[PDB]
Amino acid sequence: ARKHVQELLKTFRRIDFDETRKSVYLQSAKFGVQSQLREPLTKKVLNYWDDVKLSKTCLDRMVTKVNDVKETFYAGFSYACESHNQYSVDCLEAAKPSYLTALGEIRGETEKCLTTRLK
Ligand SMILES: [Cl-]
């Protein structure tokens, strides 16, 4: 239901982005989270009946996993890129497919743990 969308988006608010980083990177980083996680998971929880309980531990793990995957993407765009000039579009594009795939794996893991029992 709507309340589950709100609780899920509260968790997405905790997936922060460093706005001092290059805009070309930020656009790709944000798109990845939106397309691989925010849209499909919001659609999923919208279906839940009014009193479904979400697992807080599941949500918390999504946050840390995404933050690690995103830092890895940023490293490949910037200070760990050896294939092209650092901070280049070529570094970004070389690191982007594995970023998106890793976010997709987080989606599947999160879907499995999202709901829990009442108590
Ligand atoms: Cl909370």
Author numbering: 1 to 119
Paper text:
To combat these defenses, Anopheles mosquitoes produce inhibitors belonging to the SG7 protein family that block complement at the alternative C3 convertase, C3bBb. Crystal structures of albicin and SG7.AF reveal a novel four-helix bundle arrangement that is stabilized by an N-terminal hydrogen bonding network. In this study, we describe the structures of albicin and its orthologs SG7.AF (from An. freeborni) and anophensin (from An. stephensi), characterize the binding and mechanism of AP inhibition by these inhibitors, and determine a role for properdin in modulating the inhibitory activity of SG7.AF. SG7 family members are quite similar to one another structurally, but amino acid sequence divergence suggests that specific side chain interactions are key determinants for the observed differences in target affinity.
Here we show that SG7.AF, the albicin homolog from An. freeborni, has a similar potency to albicin but is more active in the presence of properdin, a plasma protein that acts to stabilize C3bBb. The backbone structure of SG7.AF is very similar to that of albicin (RMSD = 0.51 Å), with the lengths of the helices and positions of the cysteine residues being essentially the same. SG7.AF also contains an N-terminal structure identical to that of albicin where the amino group is stabilized by means of the same hydrogen bonding network. The IC50 value for SG7.AF was similar to that of albicin in NHS but increased by sixfold in PDS suggesting a role for properdin in its mechanism of action. Identically to albicin, SG7.AF showed no ability to inhibit the CP. The fact that SG7.AF remained inhibitory, albeit less so, in the absence of properdin indicates that it does not function simply as a scavenger of properdin, but rather is made more potent in its anti-C3bBb activity by properdin. Like albicin, SG7.AF did not block the activation of factor B by factor D (conversion of C3bB to C3bBb) demonstrating that it targets the C3bBb complex directly, rather than inhibiting the serine protease responsible for its activation. Together, these data suggest that SG7.AF acts similarly to albicin in that it inhibits the catalytic activity of the C3bBb complex by directly interacting with it. When injected along with C3b, factor B, and factor D, SG7.AF and albicin both cause an enhanced accumulation of C3bBb on the surface, but SG7.AF was required at higher concentrations, indicating a lower-affinity binding interaction for this inhibitor.
